[PDB]
Design a protein around this motif. Structure first.
Motif, PDB file in Angstrom:
ATOM      1  N   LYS C  46       0.874  -1.241  -0.116  1.00 23.18           N
ATOM      2  CA  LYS C  46      -0.071  -0.119  -0.077  1.00 23.18           C
ATOM      3  C   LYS C  46       0.770   1.296   0.005  1.00 23.18           C
ATOM      4  O   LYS C  46       0.397   2.254  -0.655  1.00 23.18           O
ATOM      5  CB  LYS C  46      -0.990   0.249   1.002  1.00 23.18           C
ATOM      6  CG  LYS C  46      -2.538  -0.321   0.712  1.00 23.18           C
ATOM      7  CD  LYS C  46      -2.928   0.573  -0.202  1.00 23.18           C
ATOM      8  CE  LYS C  46      -4.416   0.258  -0.711  1.00 23.18           C
ATOM      9  NZ  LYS C  46      -4.983   1.310  -1.597  1.00 23.18           N
ATOM     10  N   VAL C  53       1.018   6.207  -7.534  1.00 24.65           N
ATOM     11  CA  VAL C  53      -0.207   7.245  -7.866  1.00 24.65           C
ATOM     12  C   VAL C  53       0.530   8.687  -7.457  1.00 24.65           C
ATOM     13  O   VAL C  53      -0.310   9.409  -8.079  1.00 24.65           O
ATOM     14  CB  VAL C  53      -1.481   6.801  -6.758  1.00 24.65           C
ATOM     15  CG1 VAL C  53      -1.075   7.376  -5.420  1.00 24.65           C
ATOM     16  CG2 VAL C  53      -2.422   7.550  -7.376  1.00 24.65           C
ATOM     17  N   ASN C  59      -4.022   3.166 -10.173  1.00 23.42           N
ATOM     18  CA  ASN C  59      -4.165   2.291  -9.001  1.00 23.42           C
ATOM     19  C   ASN C  59      -3.933   0.935  -9.408  1.00 23.42           C
ATOM     20  O   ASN C  59      -3.912   0.448 -10.582  1.00 23.42           O
ATOM     21  CB  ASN C  59      -5.494   2.584  -8.302  1.00 23.42           C
ATOM     22  CG  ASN C  59      -5.443   3.623  -7.173  1.00 23.42           C
ATOM     23  OD1 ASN C  59      -4.375   3.674  -6.542  1.00 23.42           O
ATOM     24  ND2 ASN C  59      -6.573   4.329  -7.041  1.00 23.42           N
TER      25      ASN C  59
HETATM   26  C1  LIG Z   1      -6.767   5.210  -5.885  1.00 27.79           C
HETATM   27  O1  LIG Z   1      -7.483   4.925  -4.909  1.00 27.79           O
HETATM   28  C2  LIG Z   1      -7.472   5.722  -3.870  1.00 27.79           C
HETATM   29  C3  LIG Z   1      -8.167   4.794  -2.699  1.00 27.79           C
HETATM   30  O2  LIG Z   1      -7.617   3.504  -2.359  1.00 27.79           O
HETATM   31  C4  LIG Z   1      -8.493   6.765  -4.121  1.00 27.79           C
HETATM   32  O3  LIG Z   1      -8.493   7.525  -3.061  1.00 27.79           O
HETATM   33  C5  LIG Z   1      -7.656   7.367  -5.516  1.00 27.79           C
HETATM   34  O4  LIG Z   1      -8.732   8.343  -5.809  1.00 27.79           O
HETATM   35  C6  LIG Z   1      -7.618   6.498  -6.550  1.00 27.79           C
HETATM   36  N1  LIG Z   1      -7.033   7.246  -7.811  1.00 27.79           N
HETATM   37  C7  LIG Z   1      -7.806   7.342  -8.675  1.00 27.79           C
HETATM   38  C8  LIG Z   1      -6.868   8.267  -9.892  1.00 27.79           C
HETATM   39  O5  LIG Z   1      -9.084   7.536  -8.763  1.00 27.79           O
END
Ligand SMILES: *[C@@H]1O[C@H](CO)[C@@H](O)[C@H](O)[C@H]1NC(C)=O
Ligand SMILES: *[C@@H]1O[C@H](CO)[C@@H](O[C@@H]2O[C@H](CO)[C@@H](O[C@@H]3O[C@H](CO)[C@@H](O)[C@H](O)[C@H]3NC(C)=O)[C@H](O)[C@H]2NC(C)=O)[C@H](O)[C@H]1NC(C)=O
Ligand SMILES: *[C@@H]1O[C@H](CO)[C@@H](O[C@@H]2O[C@H](CO)[C@@H](O)[C@H](O)[C@H]2NC(C)=O)[C@H](O)[C@H]1NC(C)=O
Lengths: 39, 183, 135
Positions: C46, C53, C59
């Motif tokens: 994680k 990210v 993700n």
């Molecule tokens: C990736 O996941 C997180 C929570 O696990 C979320 O807050 C985030 O917005 C996600 N990324 C995108 C680009 O949506």
């Protein structure tokens, strides 16, 4: 002719993706839980 | 309006032979649809969704089928691809709405659910709302091929092999296309 | 040829204890700070997903978290324990490793996730072009 090759590969790209899947999914079940009924 | 079957069916219909229910004189409540929050896609084209429960037409048609997850973007007016070209074509001045939701747990089964087919070869793209359930062999380069696969020639239907361990965009989605018409 | 650290002299990495420049300075090792904050098996990935990210990459695919086997199981289960990244097809990506709470497997978690993010990017090409651009 070239357009005959495009229609050849589309038939290939559909039969391969499924046969490669199962052949790699069965290699996962052997790699994470070894029997000989998985080999 | 009996949306019972039309929605909560136990077995949907293929993508190459979609169904066609002709909803008729009734009391339709598109609010129970619009706010159900269970739908992953609810697009309305001729008419924005909230004003559906305030209009009246002559006929509503409902078409039903099952496709892949990332093929829901070809169910729209003016698209191209294996689905919109020759499986199910929407006219260019569509009026209804398109609804779609994921159904991985119902339609995908371990070992592969090979009962959901689609057409991948046709002579010419479909006219809007036209349907084609034939199975006559195809035809590659100039040649006879009297009913029989082989060099440049082969069946026209393939099958999604759906599996439960398939990344999203590969899991089955069920689609219902409502088309309001006014003769 | 027999004093180089392994059988063939391919890597000289086992000569570090004899060739260290300043042996009175500890080379930085964060393994004790991982077991002092009760980091599980899941924190190492994680924090690895938050690295990717952070740069503008997608993700994990959310099928990544159930299907993968991030440790050797709770069963005494015979299963080749070797870090690797699998690309079974149909948009199904799994990582197989047996991770221990160490900065070594904190780093190879970043290495093995890099094979996944490379795999998730070219998944829109046809089937015969889904490799790296060369070997
Ligand atoms: C990736 O996941 C997180 C929570 O696990 C979320 O807050 C985030 O917005 C996600 N990324 C995108 C680009 O949506
Ligand atoms: C077949 O289609 C039906 C029509 O969409 C689905 O029906 C609905 O399920 C809802 C549960 O999410 C029910 O909701 C709740 O209703 C109770 C009263 O019964 C209220 O107290 C709650 O406030 C309300 N909750 C929400 C989400 O607002 C609906 O009543 C019900 N619709 C009907 C039957 O009128 C079915 O779910 C669907 N098939 C199945 C079994 O999934
Ligand atoms: C390794 O996997 C195999 C199959 O995935 C397991 O073998 C059998 O799996 C079926 C499910 O189709 C069960 O109904 C049987 O009970 C399983 N056999 C036994 C002897 O339990 C096998 O169990 C797995 N290995 C371990 C150690 O659980």
């Amino acid at each position: 002719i070239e357009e005959q090759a495009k229609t050849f590969l589309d038939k290939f790209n559909h039969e391969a993706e499924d046969l490669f899947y199962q052949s790699s999914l069965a290699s996962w079940n052997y790699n994470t839980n070894i029997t000989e009924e998985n080999v | 309006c009996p949306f019972g079957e039309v929605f909560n069916a136990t077995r949907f219909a293929s993508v190459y032979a979609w169904n066609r229910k002709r909803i008729s004189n009734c009391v339709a409540d598109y609010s129970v649809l619009y706010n159900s929050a269970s739908f992953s896609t609810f697009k309305c084209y001729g008419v924005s969704p909230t004003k559906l429960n305030d209009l009246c037409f002559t006929n509503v048609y409902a078409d039903s089928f099952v496709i892949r997850g990332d093929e829901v973007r070809q169910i729209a007016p003016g698209q191209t691809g294996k689905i919109a070209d020759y499986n199910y074509k929407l006219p260019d001045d569509f009026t209804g709405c398109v609804i779609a939701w994921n159904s991985n747990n119902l339609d995908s089964k371990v070992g592969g659910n090979y009962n959901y087919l689609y057409r991948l070869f046709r002579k010419s793209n479909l006219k809007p709302f036209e349907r084609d359930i034939s199975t006559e062999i195809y035809q590659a380069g100039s040649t006879p091929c009297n009913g029989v696969e082989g060099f440049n020639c082969y069946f026209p239907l393939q099958s999604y092999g759906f599996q439960p361990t398939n990344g999203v965009g590969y899991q089955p989605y069920r689609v219902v296309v409502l088309s309001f018409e006014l003769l | 040829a027999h004093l180089l650290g392994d059988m063939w002299g391919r890597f000289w990495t086992n000569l570090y204890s004899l060739t260290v420049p300043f042996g009175q300075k500890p080379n930085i090792d964060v393994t004790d700070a991982m077991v002092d904050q009760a980091w599980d098996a899941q924190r190492i990935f994680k924090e690895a997903e938050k690295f990717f990210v952070s740069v503008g990459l997608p993700n994990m695919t959310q099928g990544f978290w159930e299907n993968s086997m991030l440790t050797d199981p709770g069963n005494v289960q015979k299963a080749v324990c070797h870090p690797t990244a699998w690309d079974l097809g149909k948009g199904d990506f799994r990582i197989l490793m047996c991770t221990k709470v160490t900065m070594d497997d904190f780093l190879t978690a970043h290495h093995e996730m890099g094979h996944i993010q490379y795999d998730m990017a070219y998944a829109a090409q046809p089937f015969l072009l889904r490799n790296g651009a060369n070997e």
